[PDB]
């Protein structure tokens, strides 16, 4: 009975591959071979945020493009005022091993999580005036890797137990559970309309999930190694995915296949974070080779290089309104580029 | 320069936060962080329980704080986690050392421990941190050797001919076969260790049991040695 199931599975896979080939009438490179190529963009570190003790593992931008949240491996969640280089809050963490952090769109709450398998939500602005532990979520059987707020009451989290979850802050239970990945869900990215979200795991595949219905809409398999960087395109009809094989891929939800590939002979190290600009023209990827790169999402050639960041770069992020880009590495430094 | 009242308040709050961060920096840099790793039969839980003399169902990680000679050490045991370790192991890049506990008594599984130790030793993000080996359950290994089965030769052909090294210091009243087997296991680990450690990290070996109370002192001595070697390397003296 298992043999016929395997035969039907491989037949369906072949049918999907044939459909993708049929829908692949032309490549993205050929269409964009006539557009004006982007020039050489040079970034300068306009601001430094030296205040951490251990490696910075993740960071997130606020909706005001002024306040950002940074998570350090020593057990600190620091709110940085980007303009004035001022520290707004410094939240100690019960578990020093933190791998992700999120900033709520309203700016009232902040998310944290890591090897403790518990997502901690802290209220930034209370009546007392101190940032306390508002809520703790303990349902995952694996280490948390990426969390993103949807509103003040719901949050989507991913853990290493091949499971994504949707949590209601007040109740503290899992509203929806997504179990389609094979191993070590690494990153997630919410769509602009918040209806769906994309997720990348270590099984060299990406999956699109619906927040409300709760099932995998589409699955994309185009990488060769572990996926550790994913981000949603501003248009909402595409996204980018970065792997340890020194390669980024551009996937589209309407084509169900990779649009283009960003790679080079010189680069052989992995990619930890990926982000888009306001227009989506520039794709920023943090390679773990003491540097960062900026490509263009239309012809796949080098456009800019960011340097001066000691140790592997861990977190990358452009402001929601496109002001600047913040990069955090394992050297306990945050650098702002404009 | 001219600043607003709100800007002055923000600067004062930032100064207070910086003062708190400076206060916490001394605490952070005065504590040594260790990563405890081992198999299910390695007996690391017994080691933690013995060394504790100094939550939820999915806690994900357990921390134990022990103080030796007024020096604090935070050892982190990994639990309620999947068998995949290629990703979260990168989190322990700045730890003082990795305490790898291997049960040498039980055979037909020492190859798995050797492979795991080799993967840890050759890890790109673990090429600087040192490894402290705990050959746990030595009494069980001695009893198994004295049982007469002599199954060590079957699993490892290299044990067919192996002379005890001259640097060996067997305990009094110990069978030479037990010493030979124990040092053969130690040399099997050391052969893997001495292949990519170009003066960066070492493989301090220790023969341990589930009842030994000197494990904390051994860990403290190994950490002191690691710190001294790092300081000497910073001065180009070694």
């Amino acid at each position, epitope marked *: 009975e298992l043999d016929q199931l395997r035969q039907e599975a491989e037949q369906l896979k072949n049918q999907i591959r044939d459909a993708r080939k049929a829908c692949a009438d032309a490549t993205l490179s050929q269409i964009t071979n006539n557009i004006d190529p982007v020039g050489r963009i040079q970034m300068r570190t306009r601001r430094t945020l030296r205040g951490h003790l251990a490696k910075i593992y993740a960071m997130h931008w606020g909706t005001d493009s002024r306040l950002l949240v940074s998570a350090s491996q020593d057990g600190k969640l620091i709110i940085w005022d980007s303009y004035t280089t001022n520290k707004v809050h410094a939240i100690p963490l019960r578990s020093s091993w933190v791998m992700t952090c999120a900033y709520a769109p309203s700016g009232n709450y902040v998310a944290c999580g890591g090897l403790d398998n518990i997502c901690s939500i802290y209220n930034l602005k209370t009546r007392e005036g101190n940032v306390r532990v508002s809520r703790e979520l303990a349902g995952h059987t694996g280490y948390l890797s990426c969390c993103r707020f949807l509103d003040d009451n719901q949050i989507v989290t991913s853990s290493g137990d091949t499971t994504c979850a949707l949590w209601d802050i007040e109740t503290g239970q899992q509203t929806t559970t997504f179990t389609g990945h094979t191993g070590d869900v690494m990153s997630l990215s919410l769509a602009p309309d918040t209806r769906l979200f994309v997720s990348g795991a270590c099984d*060299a595949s990406a999956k699109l999930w619906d927040v409300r219905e709760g099932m995998c809409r589409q699955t994309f398999t185009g990488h060769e190694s572990d996926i550790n960087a994913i981000c949603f395109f501003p248009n909402g009809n595409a996204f980018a995915t970065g792997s340890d094989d020194a390669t980024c891929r551009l996937f589209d939800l309407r084509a169900d296949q990779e649009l283009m590939t960003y790679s080079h002979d010189n680069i052989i190290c992995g990619i930890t974070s990926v982000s888009f600009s306001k227009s989506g023209r520039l794709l920023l990827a943090g390679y773990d080779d003491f540097n960062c790169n900026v490509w263009d999402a239309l012809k796949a050639d080098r456009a800019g290089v960011l340097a001066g960041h000691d140790n592997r770069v861990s977190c990358l992020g452009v402001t929601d309104d496109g002001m600047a880009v913040a990069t955090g590495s394992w050297d306990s430094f945050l650098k702002i580029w404009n | 320069c001219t600043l607003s009242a709100e800007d002055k308040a923000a600067v004062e709050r930032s100064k207070m936060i910086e003062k708190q961060l400076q206060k916490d920096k001394q605490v952070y840099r005065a504590t040594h962080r260790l990563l405890l790793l081992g198999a299910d039969n390695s007996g690391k839980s017994t080691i933690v329980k013995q060394m504790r003399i100094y939550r939820v169902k999915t806690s994900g990680i357990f921390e134990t704080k022990f103080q030796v000679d007024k020096v604090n050490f935070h050892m982190f045991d990994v639990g309620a986690q999947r*068998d*995949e370790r290629r990703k979260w192991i990168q989190c322990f890049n700045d730890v003082t050392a990795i305490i790898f506990v291997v049960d040498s008594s039980d055979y037909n599984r020492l190859q798995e421990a050797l492979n795991d130790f080799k*993967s840890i030793w050759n890890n790109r993000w673990l090429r600087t941190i040192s490894v402290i080996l705990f050959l746990n359950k030595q009494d069980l290994l001695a009893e198994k050797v004295l049982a007469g089965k002599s199954k060590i030769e079957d699993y490892f052909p290299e044990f067919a001919r192996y002379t005890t090294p001259e640097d060996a210091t067997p305990e009094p009243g110990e069978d030479p076969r037990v010493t030979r087997a124990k040092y053969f296991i130690r040399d099997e680990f050391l052969r893997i260790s001495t292949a990519s450690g170009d003066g960066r990290h070492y493989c301090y070996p220790h023969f341990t049991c589930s009842v030994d109370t000197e494990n904390a002192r051994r860990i403290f001595n190994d950490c002191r040695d690691i710190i001294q070697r790092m300081h000497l390397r910073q001065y180009e003296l070694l």
Partner: nanobody
Amino acid sequence: QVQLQESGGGLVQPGGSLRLSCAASGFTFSNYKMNWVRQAPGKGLEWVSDISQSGASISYTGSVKGRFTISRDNAKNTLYLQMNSLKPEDTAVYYCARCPAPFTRDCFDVTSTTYAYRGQGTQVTV
């Protein structure tokens, strides 16, 4: 997509010889270190042998050292395992596992229960 297909199983009398071939598709074969995993009935995954990207560094477990040989064909993207003088204790399922990351000597999770970059395996009975 990662494809790893094994071929060469079947019943063999004790002391026989076998040729196990692993075909890899979906990635650059030369950039990844390869190794074999063994799963005996009523037992867990066991590592047998490993070979690096170029084949210069090769190693085997003690139980099979001197009896099994491994080789690579980067031109055809194939991994070959020659078994000589088989034993009744070798009746098991053999899998070809690929290192998660390229241009790296070490690689974890080779013998994982649910490892992704591992083939379906072939049954060898002695």
